[PDB]
Amino acid sequence: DVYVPDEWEVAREKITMSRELGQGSFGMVYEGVAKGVVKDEPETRVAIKTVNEAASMRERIEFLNEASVMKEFNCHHVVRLLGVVSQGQPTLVIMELMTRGDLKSYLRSLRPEENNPVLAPPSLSKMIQMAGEIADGMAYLNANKFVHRDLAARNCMVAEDFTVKIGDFGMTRDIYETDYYRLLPVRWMSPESLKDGVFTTYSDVWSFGVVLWEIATLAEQPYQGLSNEQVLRFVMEGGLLDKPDNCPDMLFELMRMCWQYNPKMRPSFLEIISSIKEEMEPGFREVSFYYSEENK
Ligand SMILES: C[C@@]1(C(=O)Nc2ccc(F)nc2)CCCN1c1nc(Nc2cc(C3CC3)n[nH]2)c2cccn2n1
Numbered sequence: 001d002v003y004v005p006d007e008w009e010v011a012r013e014k015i016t017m018s019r020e021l022g023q024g025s026f027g028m029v030y031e032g033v034a035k036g037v038v039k040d041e042p043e044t045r046v047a048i049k050t051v052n053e054a055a056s057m058r059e060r061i062e063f064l065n066e067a068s069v070m071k072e073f074n075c076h077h078v079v080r081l082l083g084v085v086s087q088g089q090p091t092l093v094i095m096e097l098m099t100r101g102d103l104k105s106y107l108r109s110l111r112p113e114e115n116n117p118v119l120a121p122p123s124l125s126k127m128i129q130m131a132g133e134i135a136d137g138m139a140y141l142n143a144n145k146f147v148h149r150d151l152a153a154r155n156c157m158v159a160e161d162f163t164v165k166i167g168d169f170g171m172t173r174d175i176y177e178t179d180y181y182r183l184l185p186v187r188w189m190s191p192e193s194l195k196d197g198v199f200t201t202y203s204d205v206w207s208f209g210v211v212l213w214e215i216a217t218l219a220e221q222p223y224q225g226l227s228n229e230q231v232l233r234f235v236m237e238g239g240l241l242d243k244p245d246n247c248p249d250m251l252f253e254l255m256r257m258c259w260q261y262n263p264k265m266r267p268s269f270l271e272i273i274s275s276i277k278e279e280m281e282p283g284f285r286e287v288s289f290y291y292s293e294e295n296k
Pocket of ligand 1: 021022023024029047048049079095096097098099100101102154155156157166167168169171172173174
């Protein structure tokens with residue numbers, strides 16, 4: 001209850017709303033341009049989250065406080081919060097623009113459609129690059145004392161230059177209702193989370209393993225031939241996802257490491273990056289949390 005304006009407050013005149021991106025939790029999200037949000041840059045392509053005209057003051061306050069969690073993060077592999085327009089209406093939250101949408105949407109767009117030629121499935125190098133970027137964003141969140149609880153391809157975003165980042169929170173779907181069971185994302189959950197409802201960085205690692213499986217299958221439904229109730233029993237009884245068709249053993253071995261029944265036996269996000277750092281683009285050493293002074 002109640003929102004206090006801070007240093008993140010940006011004047012309304014600096015914001016220009018253009019094309020629609022999609023429906024958000026509190027209202028329509030638009031793309032556009034912003035002045036003075038990235039230092040003194042006069043024109044930065046941004047994503048603008050809005051609150052619907054018919055919403056109450058409680059809903060506007062809820063939107064601002066929920067979005068304010070992003071203020072604590074400064075990572076190249078996590079979607080950035082750039083500004084907040086709380087003074088007057090429409091209520092706005094300025095975000096970093098990710099032109100290629102969510103990773104699940106991007107992976108499904110790569111699937112072959114009839115007769116016309118198609119691009120070959122993403123190469124191991126391209127899959128490892130995505131893996132290291134997701135793991136870096138997650139290693140940053142864990143170091144900042146956060147547990148994601150909903151790590152999935154649908155909750156990862158793809159930038160113009162194809163860089164994958166940890167997406168904005170609660171901005172999931174609205175076309176992925178099937179990925180949840182009543183509330184909880186059962187097909188992405190660790191055996192311990194399905195048992196006691198407790199989530200840790202170890203359960204986030206389990207979910208990361210499922211993200212790798214999504215990349216290798218081009219966002220197929222995990223445990224496809226099983227219902228939500230069957231998934232619960234299968235995973236809790238020690239069941240695992242099958243090795244995807246044409247998936248290199250190197251990528252599947254990493255999935256198996258994430259899928260260890262004992263949460264303490266799973267590798268950390270830092271341990272995951274360490275095993276694949278040699279395969280990352282040279283630029284990773286300059287932009288990642290892994291190589292920054294913050295990782296100590
Ligand atoms: C606007 C919205 C979104 O916020 N997606 C989304 C999904 C998961 C996640 F983790 N973060 C954002 C809602 C549903 C569709 N969508 C979206 N967003 C895009 N881009 C986008 C969203 C954001 C944060 C402001 C929210 N930055 N950039 C985008 C590019 C191409 C298609 N889309 N579609």
